[model samples]
Target chain A: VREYQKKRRRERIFRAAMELFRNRGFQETTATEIAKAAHVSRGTFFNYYPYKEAVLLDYGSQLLAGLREEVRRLLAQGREPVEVLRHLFRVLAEGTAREKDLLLPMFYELLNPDPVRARAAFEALPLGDLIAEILKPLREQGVLRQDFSLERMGRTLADLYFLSALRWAAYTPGRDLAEELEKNLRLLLEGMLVREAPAPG
Target chain B: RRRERIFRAAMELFRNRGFQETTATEIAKAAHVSRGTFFNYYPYKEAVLLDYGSQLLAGLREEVRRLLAQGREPVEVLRHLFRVLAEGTAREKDLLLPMFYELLNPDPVRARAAFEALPLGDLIAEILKPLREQGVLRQDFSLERMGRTLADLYFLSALRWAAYTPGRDLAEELEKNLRLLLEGMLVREAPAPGG
Candidate 1:
């Protein structure tokens, strides 16, 4: 088969899988149904995606791909690194809120018990790398703390984002994720402790 | 009737042999119960650890209540709680490591159960409530979210320390990270920016 034909079939399978997952719930959807929905054979669906959850990896990868391009575009336009970071959080938080069910499975897959699959999921979704890119200029300008490695700090922020979303999903499903995320981001950027004014000479 | 014996025996084996190393049969043998009985009590090995973690949280909850009753500063209480938790989990890293992994179980039902049993977030919220009321904490988000986020950061930090930084002092590591997270990421001298 030609490369473009393969790509088209794969994309069709992915779209069909996501629709069924959103409507019928992840566990209720089956590979056979997904294949039928996409007008392909079950064998073709399996060839495209080894497992149902593999589709989620692609879904997650595509989301990151879009956000990565957005980050690049914003930085290319000379926007401040902090602004880019805030915008990234807002976009991700909104996307997560909108796709809670789908994103939850992806997030769980990222922390899967199997080391191989977890690492693969992490590689497929490089949220931390994207955050590090945005933070690069800020660190260079001495805007961020110098003690922690840029990569470590970036990873922690990405983790915090994950935790924030998880807790929101668990405890308060009604709240706006964007507001919660923006507030948490601000707390991280500004620090949590109450500061005193500079001492008079 | 012998459930407690099985739990105690399993915890002992876990401490010495680690969670992944210790098996259900070993636990049954250690507790003098049948393998089937062990399974009856704890459907999985991590279930015993969950109970152990829950007990630890209960102890902390009591301590927090007693300390707050004495009019202690909330920030100090939080710091102390982190130190104590680090000390407890650090000494038993082999067992706690698996418990941490259980919190990340892909099954939402199991994962949520693990998280609720630990109750670190609720305990932290209790400790930080005074600050929230006094406006020392940022007023932008609900206190509960802040408390939970702080607890989440602790779990991630502790997990890294347990899994990777074996030689490092988890207590000091936790303290430093908590300070950095609480004090914000930016240096004080940086001009106020970002909308």
Candidate 2:
């Protein structure tokens, strides 16, 4: 099979498992059920996924890719990279609508992952580069500040996105995750300590 | 006796293999204790990581007290605090890096307990107490927002620093990250409407 086909197959298997996980609780869903739903034997399921929960991770990897796509689409409209990013975060709240039920359990499982998979999750997304890509053009145009580290900001924003997502998933009762992320992101972007704009000169 | 022995053995195996690859049974066997005894000391293996966080938190409190007594500027004081933390984590990076992820994982329960015990956000706000008292912070600066922002920045910085290529000076990387965050975070940009 071609590489893309294999990836698609894995994704199909992943979605089937997620569909089951969605309807039933994660703990309640057995590997046999997932394998049977995916129409793959237990052995074939094991060949691709280490266990039931890892498929959630494989699903997670798919979710973040859309963020990158949104970044690309938004930036192409000639919006400021910073503003574009802020807007995209609000969209993520709505975008994550489908996955909300699944994420809460996924976070639970991820807390104490096997070392090999834990390492993979951290390095898998490459979120730093995606944000950096958005910021790149803005910096070159001298619209962004001179002293800031692109990579640092990139990592920080990406980290905040995940933090906000998890906090959102946990149903923390202030604002929804979208608003929380959008608000904090704007604070980081607009500079938290900057005073009243020199009193309008 | 069993508790002490298990910690020792876990550390040994963690060094030999690592906590991820090292299993509870193996740790129990190495400690010469039954797996049941291991559970008595630790509910889960990840608890060891929490023990490490507790150590760093205590050390941080000691330094913050000293720095405040020294009467340094907020920037310098914060710089010192961040530099020390990043450097401290780097020293244990091999053993502790894996644990850092768990700090924010699964749910907010463990992270919440860890934060409460560490008093990380509170400590950061407390350290900045001098700045607020001196009116060095912006007149409109919400103490709560600033404190949370500072804590999050420190956390994300440490995480990124750990992820950075090994041999990178953690203290320097921390300083750089803090500088970047402070320079960007602390400075006010466009004014809010009708303020």
Candidate 3:
């Protein structure tokens, strides 16, 4: 019961902080104010979160973990490589959709040109490496071009997909995320797939 | 009256002096409100930014949803989407452009957070799902691959374009360049003239 109460208090504080940050803006709100709004003591707030930014950092870590787990599961299913990738992306989209508001605030915060968050965002997960590993089998099977560099391809593709999604999120609200992804994938693959290079002599 | 006055002052101050430089006291003085009153409505200077940011987010979401529901062709959909964005940029050219620039340049920490906060990868993944189902995309294409690729292309292109031309008609130029790049300006080679 005591542990559960502690957890609840932490969640309450976090929730209040997020709401205040979203509505009131992060820089505008103070730790004292957040604790007061959350109905928790300042000490409790500190106990749960080391700093004001800690709330976002902690949540971001969880989100990355969730994404990694989903991708890993999809990859482990032994499905076709492309299919697995599709499922993985779909899962990611769904997750983002659910956390749009929370995610948006953090995204905007990270884009602030601060090296701290930038490094944090980049180093949060090994998404690129994981993607490259997934593509390795496909490359080995000759499904992909022999010259395909998994690392470069993975990094490039990841950036592309992320930018596209960000634009959509920033610009389009009610559109079906699933449908948007499908169209983007089409455009990317159309350019990437192996094509005959003048039919080797 | 108080809220409107405060908002107006904030807008002007944010536009001129910039968000970080402009203080609540300055805004209150400009709006002819007491310092205490300024605190009554807006808790902090950043509140003004968040207020506008929320509105922008809401408006963008609505527009995208409306566009997506129109059932336009894939290419056309993209074209229209870019056009809408261009139009908005043009409409809010003075206010939006400089503010965005400030966010990226002078206030990079916040800018990075905002940039990464949006569910962009998810949005791209969602947009591409239909195209894949319709056979417009290769069967082997994966959502992850497509989403990431699209994201990189859009952002890098935007950054490049923005750098090349500061406040010009980015949408039109982007549309033209993107169409050419995506659709291919070069004609396909025919059987090498009967080789």
DockQ leader: 1
lDDT of 1 by residue, A1-201 (tens): 699998988889999998999899987899999999999999999998887888998988999999999999999999998899899999998888888888777776756656668677878888888998988898888778888777867777887888778767755678888987887677777776665545599
Model-by-model DockQ, in order? 0.42, 0.25, 0.06
CAPRI rating of model 1: acceptable
Query: Which scores higher on lDDT, 1 or 3?
Result: 1
Task: Please give the ranking of all candidate structures by DockQ, highest first, separated by commas.
Answer: 1, 2, 3
Candidate 1 regions with alpha-carbon error over 4 angstroms: A36-44, A195-201, B1-6, B13-47, B57-94, B101-116, B122-145, B159-176, B190-195
Q: What is the lDDT of residue B164 in candidate 1?
A: 55
Off by over 4 Å in 2: A1-11, A50-54, A105-115, A146-149, A171-175, A195-201, B1-56, B93-102, B105-109, B133-141, B157-167, B185-195
Q: Give the TM-score of candidate 3.
A: 0.47
Candidate 1 vs 2: which has more DockQ = 1
DockQ result, candidate 2: 0.25
Tens digits of per-residue lDDT, candidate 2, A59-79, equal: 776777877777888788777
**Ranking of predictions according to lDDT:** 1, 2, 3
Residue A54 displacement (Å), model 1 = 1.8
**Poorly placed runs, candidate 3 (over 4 Å):** A1-30, A33-54, A146-148, A192-201, B1-154, B157-195
Q: Where is model 3 chain A poorest over a 10-residue stretch in terms of lDDT?
A: A188-197
Judged by whole-model lDDT over C-alpha atoms, candidate 2 comes out at 0.69
Chain A TM-scores, candidates in order: 0.89, 0.81, 0.69
Candidate closest to the true structure, highest TM-score:
1
